[PDB]
Write a protein that binds this DNA or RNA. Structure first.
Lengths: 100, 138, 74
RNA sequence: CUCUAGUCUGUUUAAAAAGGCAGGGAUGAGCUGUGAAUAGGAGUGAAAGGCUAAACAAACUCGGAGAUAGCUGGUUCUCCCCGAAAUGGAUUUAAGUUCAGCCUUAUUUUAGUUUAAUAGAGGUAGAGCACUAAUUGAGCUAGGGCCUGUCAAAGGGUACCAAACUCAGUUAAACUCCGAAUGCUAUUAAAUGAUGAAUAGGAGUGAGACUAUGGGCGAUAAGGUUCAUAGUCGAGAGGGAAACAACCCAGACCAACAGCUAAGGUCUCAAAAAUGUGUUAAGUGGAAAAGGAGGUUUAGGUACGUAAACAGCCAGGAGGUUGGCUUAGAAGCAGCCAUACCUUUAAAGAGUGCGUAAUAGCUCACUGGUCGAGUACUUAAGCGCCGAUAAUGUAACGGGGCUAAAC
RNA sequence: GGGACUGACACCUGCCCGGUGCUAGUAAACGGCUAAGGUAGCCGGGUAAGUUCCGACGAAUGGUGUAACGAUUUGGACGCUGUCUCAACGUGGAGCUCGGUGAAAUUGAAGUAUCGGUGAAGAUGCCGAUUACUUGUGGUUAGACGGAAAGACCC
RNA sequence: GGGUAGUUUGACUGGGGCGGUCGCCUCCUAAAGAGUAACGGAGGUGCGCAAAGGUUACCUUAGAGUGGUUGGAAAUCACUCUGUAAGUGUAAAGGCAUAAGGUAGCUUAACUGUAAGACUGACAAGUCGAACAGAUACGAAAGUAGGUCUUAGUGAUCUGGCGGUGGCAAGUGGAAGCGCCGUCACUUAACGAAUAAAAGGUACUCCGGGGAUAACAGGCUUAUCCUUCCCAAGAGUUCACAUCGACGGAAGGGUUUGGCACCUCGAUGUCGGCUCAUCGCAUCCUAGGGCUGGAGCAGGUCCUAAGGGUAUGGCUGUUCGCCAUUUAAAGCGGUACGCGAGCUGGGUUCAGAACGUCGUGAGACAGUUUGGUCCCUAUCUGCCACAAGCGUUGGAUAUUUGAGAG
């Protein structure tokens, strides 16, 4: 079987083998994060949940500007426009909880 | 054949052709059209093969409009050469078509005969097609 | 049958050197260009090769009038 | 006694060039013993770049000499901290070397970078025809040609070849009347803590590769060549993709028979799942095109109907009129014109097919009964079928197997 | 006497002085044939079936013939045969067993199976699957990109 | 004056060579700062100008339409519409209505000493520059003028020559010579230039290395090649599809010729032949069918099917091809274009010699002819055979059912 086709096929099968349950969990997390970001002037706790390896250079710089270097990083920040923009950039790699 | 009679530059770079059609996508001069369902290149010579098919099927009933003109050189290096010198030479002419280009238009004949003739034309083109009546008149 | 051509000059690095709103002091080069792509306004001068330079310290500004762009120091 | 064509053994042989068979010369340009002469950029050569102490396109020994090599190989005990480049410029350069960039040590110095707000310049994508070009159907019309009461004068018909003009619709990296999204640059406020800069000391690198995008070249072929952004490997262990440096997850100070998770899975091999609602009969899942196609789920149109729709069955399916002909013959069926032929009209086409030299004949469309409501043609979405096809052995779920343990 | 050229013998050996050698000339000089354009000469048969063979470039770096000669090359005929269809048997030296003596090259090791795949892109070492009691000897090399020669070809 | 000696004769290159190219400028490629490769796609250039420079003043084309001796479509002139498409020494781009376009007058700033502050940049270099002093030119003056509307028209250092200045003057004083300032002489075009001064062959070759780089194969792709399929205008008396199926379209096979240069140059031995096979089916024949414009016979086309078989000679090294007899039929491919640690060396691919052609020659030529070493005792795996030990559950001796295999 030709190598071009088998490489395409192997990649397509790997991509398509994602679980809808995991996708639903991710969607729920994204909705929660957007709901929190929609607020204004609250103290929010930011957890880093996805690694920095392999991500874009710009986004690694944004995360290090937020203060998160590892998974399991905990930082409290006051939501103004700057922090809101950074969180929007890196929404897919963070978990936002609110500090009552 | 169908081919431009004068060009500024003999050879041009093969772009990437993509996206649907945003223009030339509506029936203008006729009654029935042969839209494409793909994005690809239609050579001049396939164009004239489809034109013969339509015209010959139509016993003087109506008119045929060709909505594409090739105007794009297709170069090919000589048969047995290596990758060295550069930009070999024009071989034949291509026209660009995108998903939604009308590509062919017919007037005069009954709808059944037009549909037959225009499937007869679609049998000779390299893209999936669809036969469309005006969908806003009858 | 080799290539008949393949010949290019050195890139001349034209363009705007100080962005609108930046602070410059006297004599700065603002634009390098062939021809008055940008014309001269208040407090700037034009070199023999249409370079735009600042006659005094200030802040660069670009204005548009009848579709032509003018550079000034304010 | 001197030589070796041909063939064979031998070829880690008995021999670092023989032997076993054979052949040539064999009173002569003959063989041979014993002495002597010609030595290295020279000698000798009945002449093959031969020989000259088993090796000669310039012998051997010693010395210069440890000659020079951008070439290859090798370079030995341990720990801690920081951490590349494979780019640019130049080169008798392309396997080298040098400068910059990148790295490290020490001192001094303090504002990288990421946003938000605000303020700036584009011509890219896209779009478009005002400009430069390509180009389609109509309207209009010069001009040119043809024809026509034309001598080559002054005239007309324009089937055309057609500038320009009007309407409508299209192509362009080297067309742009317009123009993003990002990126780039400046200022301020937050946020992030030695990531910036300078000097001094010391290198190494100057062969990249792949993937996700934007490209050029090639053949919108190549693990191909060459650029731009980012990541990875390079220099990165571990988990996953059956195996599989570049893909996905994830940065290893050490120890532990602790817990929660990512990617990826939960029938078993092999640590992990069940319930609900649909689809799938093809093991599809568990490769792939155009196309063919009463597969089926669901949804939406057009034909059509309880006043008798479709299918089947029982009848009619006509005459004027070989429709006019072409042709040798066309009577509905070599072929041409149309069926602007009406009529008794149930309903009957200037006849649907088969077969007849031409007819005949057998049937169809159409219509009436019987029976009794969906039928007849398309469109949208989800799974399917054929298409589907190479050579050591089932070999395109990892395998067992699975109708869900598929989706 | 020295050098060059040709090469028994037979018939012939023509044209050109621009260029380059030699002392305007010289071609039996280097060479050419505008300085001068080359003179002489150089399908048939064989076989049932024949890309072979036989018969119809160039003139002293020589052209065309030639008796005799040749461990020269090629074709055909006769005779003869294990060359072949087609091999079998026998003989002699090895090989085989035992006794004595006793190597070599190679060598990271090894309780080293195969197939289908993947992979520095031809797998003994990986994945899946299949096969296989343990260990020798006599045979044969398919592999271990075998050993031997820092490939002689290319750059 | 190759008799002899010392040396040179480049690099890039989708191997190398041949060919082409080497500086600089304009546009695109270039993905909207800048920058950004190619043997990517298009052009120009190693100048010209004493005005085509500077300054002041004054003016605007090209095209369409209309009217006029030559004069016509178009020469010159008038007007309407159009508003830069005209024109800017020279290529193109960016610009130029205040025109940088055109005309006229004056004139030489086509200056000297200089320069705050910058762009571009490895460096060396290159470019812009307000403003200051002297001397002007033009204008009434303010101001402008340090060449050309801008962007190519160019060349370092060393050496040498000319002019000016008068610093250096080997005991002193002169002088030679040199420094300083001005400045000329390099197709050094291989243009950041190794010498003031330079061509080829090596198949007699040699050395140091490279799969960083070719040829035989492996691997990738499928242009090409081959095998199909989709549409059916027709031919076939009429009858698109018995058959052939015109012009096109969509794919497979990875065997031909190629691309690419990924494995390999401290060696993967290259074409045929002989011996020995094995596998695929896209089936040459034998077998089982469908349809024919299939009467029978003999076929044609199509489907299924690889169990077996699939020839001997003349020519050629030959694969292939041709030819003669045959046979029911004399298939197509893969396996390092099967098989040289099995054989053969005819050819290819060494050193001899001759011929043809090219080069002055040395020599070169997938032009021709002849001669011209094929090494190795099998360690493992694999296979063809025979045994030793052991198990099969008490130990042995015989007869056999049978998985499985040939």
């Amino acid at each position: 079987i030709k190598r071009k086709l088998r490489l395409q096929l192997k990649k397509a099968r790997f991509n398509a083998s994602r679980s809808r349950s995991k996708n639903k969990c991710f969607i729920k997390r994204m909705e929660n994060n957007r709901k929190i970001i929609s607020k204004n002037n609250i103290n929010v706790q930011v957890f880093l949940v996805r690694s920095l390896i392999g991500k874009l250079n710009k986004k690694v710089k944004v995360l290090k500007a937020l203060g998160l270097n590892k998974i399991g990083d905990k930082k409290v920040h006051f939501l103004n426009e700057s922090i809101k923009g950074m969180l929007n950039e890196t929404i897919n790699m963070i978990l936002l909880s609110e500090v009552m | 054949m169908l081919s431009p009679k004068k060009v500024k530059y003999r050879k041009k770079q093969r772009g990437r052709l993509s996206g649907e059609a945003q223009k030339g996508n509506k029936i203008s001069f006729g009654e029935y059209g042969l839209v494409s369902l793909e994005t690809n290149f239609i050579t001049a010579r396939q164009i004239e093969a489809a034109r013969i098919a339509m015209t010959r099927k139509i016993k003087r009933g109506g008119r045929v409009w060709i909505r594409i003109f090739p105007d794009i050189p297709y170069t090919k290096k000589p048969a047995e050469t290596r990758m060295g010198k550069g930009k070999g030479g024009v071989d034949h002419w291509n026209a660009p078509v995108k998903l939604g280009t009308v590509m062919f238009e017919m007037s005069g004949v009954v709808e059944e005969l037009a549909q037959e003739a225009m499937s007869l034309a679609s049998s000779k083109l390299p893209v999936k097609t669809m036969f469309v009546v005006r969908r806003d008149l009858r | 049958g080799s290539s008949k051509n393949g010949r290019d000059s050195i890139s001349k690095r034209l363009g705007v050197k100080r962005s609108g709103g930046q602070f410059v002091k006297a004599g700065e080069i603002i634009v390098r260009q062939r021809g008055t792509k940008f014309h001269k306004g208040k407090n700037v001068g034009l070199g023999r090769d249409y370079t735009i330079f600042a006659l005094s310290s200030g802040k660069v500004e670009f204005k548009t009038l009848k579709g032509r762009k003018y550079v000034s120091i304010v």
